[PDB]
Amino acid sequence: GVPLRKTIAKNLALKENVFMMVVCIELKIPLFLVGKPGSSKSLAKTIVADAMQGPAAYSDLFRSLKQVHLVSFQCSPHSTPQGIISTFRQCARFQQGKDLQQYVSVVVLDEVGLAEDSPKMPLKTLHPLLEDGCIEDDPAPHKKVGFVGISNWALDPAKMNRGIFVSRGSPNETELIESAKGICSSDILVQDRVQGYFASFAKAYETVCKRQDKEFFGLRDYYSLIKMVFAAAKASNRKPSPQDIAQAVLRNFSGKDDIQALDIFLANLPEAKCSEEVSPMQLIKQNIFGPQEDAESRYLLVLTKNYVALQILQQTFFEGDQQPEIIFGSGFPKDQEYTQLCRNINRVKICMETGKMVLLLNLQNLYESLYDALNQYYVHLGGQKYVDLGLGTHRVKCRVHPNFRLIVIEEKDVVYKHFPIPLINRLEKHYLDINTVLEKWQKSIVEELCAWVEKFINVKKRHKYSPSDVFIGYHSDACASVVLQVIERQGPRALTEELHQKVSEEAKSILLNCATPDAVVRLSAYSLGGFAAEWLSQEYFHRQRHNSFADFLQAHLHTADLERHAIFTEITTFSRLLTSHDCEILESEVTGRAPKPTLLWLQQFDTEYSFLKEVRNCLTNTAKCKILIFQTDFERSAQLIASAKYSVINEINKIRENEDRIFVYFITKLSRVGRGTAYVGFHGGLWQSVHIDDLRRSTLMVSDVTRLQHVTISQLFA
Amino acid sequence: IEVWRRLVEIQFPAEHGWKESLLGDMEWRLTKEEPLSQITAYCNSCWDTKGLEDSVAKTFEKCIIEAVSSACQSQTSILQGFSYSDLRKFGIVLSAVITKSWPRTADNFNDILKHLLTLADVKHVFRLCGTDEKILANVTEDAKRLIAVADSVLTKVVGDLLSGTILVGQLELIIKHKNQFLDIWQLREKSLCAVEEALDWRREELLLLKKEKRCVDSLLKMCGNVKHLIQVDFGVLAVRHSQDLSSKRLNDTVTVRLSTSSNSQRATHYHLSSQVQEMAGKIDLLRDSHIFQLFWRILELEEVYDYLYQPSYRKFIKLHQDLKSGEVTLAEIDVIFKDFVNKYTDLDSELKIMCTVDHQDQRDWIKDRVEQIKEYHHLHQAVHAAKVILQVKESLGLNGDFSVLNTLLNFTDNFDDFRRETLDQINQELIQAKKLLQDISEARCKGLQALSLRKEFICWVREALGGINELKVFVDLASISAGENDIDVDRVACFHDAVQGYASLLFKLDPSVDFSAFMKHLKKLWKALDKDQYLPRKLCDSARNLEWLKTVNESHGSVERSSLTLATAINQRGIYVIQAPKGGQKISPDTVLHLILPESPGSHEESREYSLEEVKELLNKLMLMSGKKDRNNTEVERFSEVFCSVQRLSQAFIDLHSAGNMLFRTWIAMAYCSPKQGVSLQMDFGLDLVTELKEGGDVTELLAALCRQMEHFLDSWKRFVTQKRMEHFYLNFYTAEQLVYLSTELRKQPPSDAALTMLSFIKSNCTLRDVLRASVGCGSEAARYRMRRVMEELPLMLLSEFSLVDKLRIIMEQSMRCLPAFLPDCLDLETLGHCLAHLAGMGGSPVERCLPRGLQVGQPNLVVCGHSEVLPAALAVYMQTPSQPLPTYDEVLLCTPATTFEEVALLLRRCLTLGSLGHKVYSLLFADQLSYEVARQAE
């Protein structure tokens, strides 16, 4: 009677959970379900909330039964008794004024095992609240609300008020094969074809679960494997090919280093004869652009090192208008709190409605709001799907556009240590680092670039500089980012050593774009006028525009591409930031191709909204070219710069109906010595990293350096 | 190159680095070229005659070996299309190619063979070495060794092939790479035709082995499918099949072809019995047949053959002959092909699989059987459609005779006896009824179904609307009623689309509409469902939500759901108020901040007051609602901005309150979300010296500026307090709240008993007369002069500055200078400190303590001991002077996780600061339990 999705495992576990949930809710028995993630508990919760719309039910059965309103509370080690009390009271308020024979309000506690032994011991309130609904106040009939507690962590039965407690263990091979058959049941030819594969995949899954150190893979991974293989066989209309099994296995059971999923699953099968490779970029793509049908795949978790995954994602797949929205924690002084969660979930919702893909940055603290949405258990109305989102005590059903996708970028180690196991199970996990994109020869080029860097720094007295002190913004991954950006700009061109040389030269050019002129002069001097040194001096002083920001701007306006309507540049300097008068000069130079460049100081902004207001004020002008300049003094700050960058990217992506051309410059004032805070640049991706020693046009010296490099000081006065 | 040698070989001393530098620049100029271009110039041009051992030659040789390494890593075959003039230099290049292309596991026989087969340069190396001797003579010794490895590998491979002793992985790689293998071997053998015969022999034998493996795999998979019910035990066969063949020598796994004896019939690793050979062959032929898979219900393999295989094959044979003859009964078609509905291409594949057995050929009858099964399935679907049409007739209330459909129902009731017939003998009348229902697909049946079950919704729609014209008015009312949640608002659109789609049947229909006229009135629905795939679901959703739809007409004209309307009003009229809590309430944002929502002409609702939690509830609501793709976000954004702005102001107030500041104790601020008569901010300090301050403009600019000044004043106040604490010793006995309490009370007559008690810790048994005498000396005439000065000056200073923020900074400065001018009933920290000093002097004798031995004066001493020892030790310290009164908090602090930095700070300040009258001791006990932050700040 209830309209389940066809790919849903109509397994015994969900059957019993629904039956129990219905009977207990209808009769206000407290019911506690404990099991490992994927054990049909939260699914049963949504199904029972949807089916038990008494008069608005889908079947005459539930129309005979009571109408259920759920008030949900997500338990944590930091949850207070007042939270549980207020939840029960809100349910009572819902039950107030109604026939308790046709309506019931239920309290649902999620992850109750987390609250078990917290120092505040809030679950104590459970005992009284389940009996009558009151801790000190006088009883009433409407205060006795129904109750279901769902948890993955074990529970104390004495606190359950002697309710009904159902604890499930990890299923066995027969149960996994029955779940798989249930998933495939929608078609019998496909189900029969895949049947052989079900046993092997179950044995492999139990192997993976016993091998791994921490619970990292669970039942959702197995179920999605069965789903993806069923879909593959269904579209092919033939037995699934080894490559499809490999691809499914890799999509689901990748993300952990000590795991060799495909080797385990292949050990159970002879398909290995093909065993073609699939890269994490192919898998991430297949997730985001999954090849009319309910072939909806889990939301992505990209595990990365040093926020690297964002460069790869922005560059490779989000080249065009598919550019998603970055959901991040603000780095502005007066904005980190509750209100940031409110705005963020508003944006998540808007992207679900509109179908815009989302990137989840340092926002794991948003999971309690997204916990049920990640399950991707959908209510339906008119074909459109709705999923629950909450911000505080309020949970609401919100519309999901079939095109919506969610990518969480997090550090691998933060995920392994802190991330809750059920969150890890709800997401499809892949590891992405530049090393995983670069081929063997591209990695070799990176090694060569690091050697070239050290030579540049020291030699191809002798203070023995460090690369960070010369290539401003240099870091362990700078050369890799450079090579990635170079080859991405080159395209997918096939490998040839000619490409190797061109790529090396491009990489050198970029690093040189980030170099000090002092360093290039040194490099010539210490090479006694070497060929390399003169080539690099030519490129820096003649084929590049470090003489000021105006020269760089002019070169960028003339030479920049026409496809890239948004062009992003990051600038580091040791000089004093530009004032409004310098922007007036830039306007006089630029007028005729763009309006006055807008200069903004990130430090001057206390709130992300105040910043966004001015970004929009600029972007709303009708000029066909716009130059926005953002200024910051590196004194902490990297968070401000990053948040401002993300915001500008998002707002440009939003103001994109126009084909106008936006040039973004981020200007960071550094110190040659420093203050311990090591500026880290070469952020790669959409950005161009350029060092300018001095942004001004040098009125006191009308010369571009490298003219004095062959003139004496006496001649200056002649 | 001549200039390079000339310049390099100049005998400059080595210490200077002439040669190395010049040669580095030359190597640089070389590397700028393409690796293959470098190798081409090296070999083709005869520049080398200059002396093959000079430094330039060795530098270029180095560069060329690096080029060859790059090419080998790139897998670029450089010898293809290559040319050369100097045999020595070409031999050097060739040796570099051989050595660099070699695998890292230089001795792995299989990886050597893989290297030889996969890499093309090997072909060229063998070709060159075969053509003329001069290349081989010029080649190095490492390359000659690697060539000897290649020769040995190839000759072993050939011996294995010819004899049959080859592993299956080698044979597989050789088959995949037969061309390179045979060319390389031909070159070698000319250097030093049966191998083609051998590779063919082994390919045939390997295909046989793989055929048998795949037959056994299919049998194993079948038994694994029936695993859930029947288990088999064939340990020997499962072990044999499980072994990885690549390591296994062919002649052991299978008899190999050699005319040494007759061409023996091949025998495999399995040695399958004849029964199991037949069974596995057939099961392999039907491995993809969905009809042979099910086809059945611990066993041994002979019992598996007898029970499972023979029945299945016999039934499959009989079914295939039934299909050929057409004698297949409708019951058999219904049981077997229940799944192939809408999958007739798969049915065609299945039936050709049945044909593969090569009995009942003609491989064309299946086209007819496929069409007959299409007809049977369409017939049953037509039956379902007819039943749905009858349900729609009774639901909508039609009267047109549909007796003809009874024909299909006449079949549907006598489903069992009629089904004893064949596929072609069914009848022509049912065929005609399907011809009629042809234009209704399962989706169209689903639409009709969504209409049928909903008679109450249909009657209500017809009573309420009566026409599609009215729907729009209804929908407006519904949008007011919706509920601002996506499902709730979307219910309206679901209903609108449902009614616009099913309008023909609901409204246009005449009850006397007959069968075909009903099909055309249905064709309009056909076009609607073609344009909308979820229209039946929208209908059903509307019918499930009928009670709300009923409410729409009479009631929901009034609801006027108001969640964003509330935010809009707050933005227009709303007023946020920040003030010190009344009733001695604890200081918190909730108590400080609250919203007033008035009423305006044209809206005479109740002037409400909202609590911070209610505003946060409204916010959460706005956010979960606000996904509507509309500009309405501006109001939510204004709302959120002002909320956050005011919240920041509130927390600044709380900070100043926590710091002990006094101005912001009677201070009330009204922030008008939109101006009232030109006023956006209003501040009143509750002081007769400070008149009401009001400013207009953007509320958020004023608020940010005011917050920044409050925060600057906070840092300035923290400095001012630290300063007065260094200037006055006794202030440190107290916290900020105690200082505020005392400032207020000591001016009273009489003070509170709590305050005199708090003073007792400085002057034991303190009384009103003690404080009255302590007031002397501190109330200098200079203080009254300052008070008069500030009370007269402030009006002028405030008139000279115009913005609220400058007037407020003036007030803040002057309050730090002379607070008595603003708050006369409070003692400034200086007069308070003086009164405390006077009391302390009027008290008993100073307290003189001495540290025990082992503890150094002027030093921060530290004692480390078991928990139980901590407390007695602290006591011995004071024991040293047992005649001295007992310590108190002034001297001893017992630390807890809840111990705040203010306590440790005040202890340290009491110890180190000057002004004290005696040599007390100061103890900080159980510090390990402190938080890291507090101990850090204390240090």
Side-chain angles (χ1 to χ4, degrees), chain A residues 56-58 188 192 195 239 338 346 349 353 382 386 391 394 396-399 497 505 606 609, chain B residues 32 70 73-74 225 288 290 293 339 485-486 490 541 544 616-617 620 623-624 626-627 637 641 648:
Chain A
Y58 313 79
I188 270 62
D192 280 16
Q195 189 202 348
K239 282 271 197 323
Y338 163 66
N346 195 38
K349 160 156 189 158
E353 284 211 66
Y386 307 75
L391 208 295
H394 317 288
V396 161
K397 297 267 189 208
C398 170
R399 198 174 61 263
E497 293 298 335
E505 303 287 15
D606 293 344
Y609 189 78
Chain B
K32 272 277 150 296
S70 94
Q73 87 86 59
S74 184
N225 299 343
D288 278 330
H290 176 272
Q293 279 188 347
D339 313 302
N485 174 6
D486 293 339
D490 294 346
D541 285 309
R544 282 194 279 99
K616 297 168 123 66
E617 179 248 12
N620 296 343
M623 296 325 196
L624 300 167
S626 162
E637 284 187 8
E641 86 173 16
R648 185 191 170 187

Side-chain angles (χ1 to χ4, degrees), chain A residues 3 55-58 63 181 187-189 192-193 195-196 237 239 270 334 338-339 342-343 345-346 349-350 353-354 379-384 386 389-399 440-441 495-498 501 505 529-532 535 606 609 613 616, chain B residues 4 25 28-29 31-32 34-35 70 73-74 217 224-226 228 287-288 290 293 339-340 343 346 454 485-487 490-491 494 534 537-538 541 544-545 616-617 619-629 633 637-638 641 643-644 647-648 698 700 704 708 711:
Chain A
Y58 313 79
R63 283 193 280 264
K181 285 170 181 182
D187 199 345
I188 270 62
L189 296 297
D192 280 16
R193 292 163 173 173
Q195 189 202 348
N237 310 300
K239 282 271 197 323
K334 265 64 193 181
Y338 163 66
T339 59
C342 298
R343 210 213 80 218
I345 64 96
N346 195 38
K349 160 156 189 158
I350 294 159
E353 284 211 66
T354 61
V379 179
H380 292 87
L381 182 90
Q384 283 165 357
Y386 307 75
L389 291 185
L391 208 295
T393 58
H394 317 288
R395 277 286 196 279
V396 161
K397 297 267 189 208
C398 170
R399 198 174 61 263
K440 303 211 311 206
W441 64 274
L495 153 56
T496 316
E497 293 298 335
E498 55 234 1
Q501 189 66 17
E505 303 287 15
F531 281 67
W535 186 95
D606 293 344
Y609 189 78
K613 285 198 296 197
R616 294 168 189 170
Chain B
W4 280 120
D25 295 17
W28 190 85
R29 284 180 63 70
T31 56
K32 272 277 150 296
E34 267 51 45
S70 94
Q73 87 86 59
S74 184
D217 181 51
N225 299 343
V226 297
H228 51 47
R287 90 195 89 81
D288 278 330
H290 176 272
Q293 279 188 347
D339 313 302
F340 281 98
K343 306 189 198 78
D346 300 348
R454 309 306 190 167
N485 174 6
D486 293 339
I487 276 192
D490 294 346
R491 279 170 159 124
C494 173
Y534 298 117
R537 193 68 64 165
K538 291 181 180 176
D541 285 309
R544 282 194 279 99
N545 297 296
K616 297 168 123 66
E617 179 248 12
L619 192 75
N620 296 343
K621 278 181 155 64
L622 293 174
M623 296 325 196
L624 300 167
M625 293 184 313
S626 162
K628 285 84 197 164
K629 313 168 205 198
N633 291 281
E637 284 187 8
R638 201 75 202 308
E641 86 173 16
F643 184 67
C644 294
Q647 274 202 284
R648 185 191 170 187
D698 193 347
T700 65
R708 290 195 295 262
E711 287 170 38

Side-chain angles (χ1 to χ4, degrees), chain B residues 327-603:
Chain B
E327 300 168 28
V328 55
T329 76
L330 292 155
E332 282 161 322
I333 294 299
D334 198 357
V335 172
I336 298 161
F337 307 94
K338 173 166 286 298
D339 313 302
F340 281 98
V341 300
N342 315 327
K343 306 189 198 78
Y344 312 112
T345 50
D346 300 348
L347 177 64
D348 168 87
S349 306
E350 180 66 28
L351 287 166
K352 265 172 290 188
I353 301 171
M354 305 188 77
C355 294
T356 64
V357 309
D358 191 359
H359 84 87
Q360 156 47 346
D361 303 307
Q362 328 341 310
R363 299 259 299 183
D364 70 327
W365 58 273
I366 65 101
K367 194 67 59 187
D368 311 335
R369 305 304 184 231
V370 165
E371 291 194 19
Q372 292 176 320
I373 294 164
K374 281 182 175 143
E375 297 324 315
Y376 173 69
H377 293 167
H378 287 70
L379 184 280
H380 203 311
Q381 287 171 355
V383 158
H384 169 68
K387 290 183 289 204
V388 173
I389 296 158
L390 271 40
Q391 294 151 11
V392 164
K393 166 173 42 88
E394 53 79 20
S395 147
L396 287 168
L398 288 326
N399 302 313
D401 160 41
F402 308 156
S403 152
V404 60
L405 304 181
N406 309 351
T407 296
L408 287 179
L409 302 209
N410 300 3
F411 155 90
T412 312
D413 50 326
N414 70 347
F415 195 44
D416 163 279
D417 55 27
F418 188 80
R419 277 185 299 149
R420 310 313 105 183
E421 305 304 334
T422 69
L423 276 280
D424 50 349
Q425 309 174 56
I426 311 191
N427 66 66
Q428 280 60 44
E429 295 93 322
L430 259 54
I431 298 298
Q432 293 149 19
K434 52 183 317 308
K435 302 178 184 181
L436 301 174
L437 277 299
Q438 283 302 143
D439 78 330
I440 320 191
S441 57
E442 264 276 20
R444 282 182 178 162
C445 295
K446 231 59 56 167
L448 298 163
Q449 277 168 288
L451 177 67
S452 73
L453 305 163
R454 309 306 190 167
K455 185 155 195 169
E456 194 183 322
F457 174 88
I458 292 166
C459 295
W460 178 81
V461 166
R462 285 171 174 180
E463 294 166 11
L465 307 191
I468 191 62
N469 322 300
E470 204 74 18
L471 182 61
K472 196 48 50 69
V473 179
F474 181 97
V475 162
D476 297 336
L477 311 182
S479 295
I480 292 162
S481 85
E484 245 303 341
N485 174 6
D486 293 339
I487 276 192
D488 290 326
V489 174
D490 294 346
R491 279 170 159 124
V492 182
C494 173
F495 174 80
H496 166 276
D497 291 1
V499 172
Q500 175 66 88
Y502 284 88
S504 62
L505 296 175
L506 291 172
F507 301 123
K508 159 60 214 158
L509 254 172
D510 186 320
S512 153
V513 154
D514 79 329
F515 195 52
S516 70
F518 196 71
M519 309 309 156
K520 49 192 167 48
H521 298 126
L522 281 177
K523 259 180 196 78
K524 296 122 189 184
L525 185 58
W526 281 188
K527 289 192 284 282
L529 292 173
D530 287 328
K531 283 205 303 282
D532 192 355
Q533 269 63 35
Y534 298 117
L535 175 66
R537 193 68 64 165
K538 291 181 180 176
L539 199 301
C540 292
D541 285 309
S542 299
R544 282 194 279 99
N545 297 296
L546 183 56
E547 301 302 280
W548 162 69
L549 294 170
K550 283 171 177 169
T551 311
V552 171
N553 243 8
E554 88 292 330
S555 148
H556 289 317
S558 47
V559 172
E560 188 28 84
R561 162 227 83 189
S562 325
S563 65
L564 321 170
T565 325
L566 181 54
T568 307
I570 293 164
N571 298 330
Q572 297 173 349
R573 284 126 49 201
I575 311 172
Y576 285 91
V577 195
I578 297 160
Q579 41 193 80
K582 310 303 171 66
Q585 286 172 352
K586 210 258 175 187
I587 200 81
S588 60
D590 311 53
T591 58
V592 167
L593 176 55
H594 72 265
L595 165 67
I596 302 299
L597 182 59
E599 53 279 297
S600 197
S603 74

Side-chain angles (χ1 to χ4, degrees), chain A residues 22-29 48-57 60-69 95 99-106 144 146:
Chain A
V22 170
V23 180
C24 296
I25 281 170
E26 182 81 6
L27 295 169
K28 299 188 171 182
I29 302 154
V48 170
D50 197 16
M52 296 190 75
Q53 293 295 319
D60 288 330
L61 192 162
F62 287 109
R63 283 193 280 264
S64 80
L65 303 190
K66 284 185 248 192
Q67 179 171 20
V68 176
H69 179 62
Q95 290 210 131
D99 183 7
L100 311 200
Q101 290 291 331
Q102 296 303 327
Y103 188 94
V104 62
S105 185
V106 175
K144 212 228 172 202

Side-chain angles (χ1 to χ4, degrees), chain A residues 557-595:
Chain A
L557 292 173
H558 298 179
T559 65
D561 191 24
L562 314 184
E563 176 272 331
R564 261 181 90 187
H565 90 117
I567 288 164
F568 296 89
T569 300
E570 180 168 2
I571 299 169
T572 155
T573 191
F574 302 143
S575 60
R576 275 168 179 89
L577 300 160
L578 302 160
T579 84
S580 302
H581 187 57
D582 300 298
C583 302
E584 293 171 341
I585 297 162
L586 291 162
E587 177 180 5
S588 79
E589 300 267 316
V590 168
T591 187
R593 40 181 88 261

Side-chain angles (χ1 to χ4, degrees), chain A residues 117-137:
Chain A
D117 190 19
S118 33
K120 313 181 248 220
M121 293 167 290
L123 298 194
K124 275 187 168 183
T125 73
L126 286 185
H127 202 74
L129 292 175
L130 294 175
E131 287 282 278
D132 306 300
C134 31
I135 288 179
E136 36 68 22
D137 45 354

Side-chain angles (χ1 to χ4, degrees), chain A residues 600-611:
Chain A
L600 300 179
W601 307 68
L602 307 182
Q603 324 97 303
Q604 253 177 29
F605 281 97
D606 293 344
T607 55
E608 190 173 353
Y609 189 78
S610 69
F611 182 63

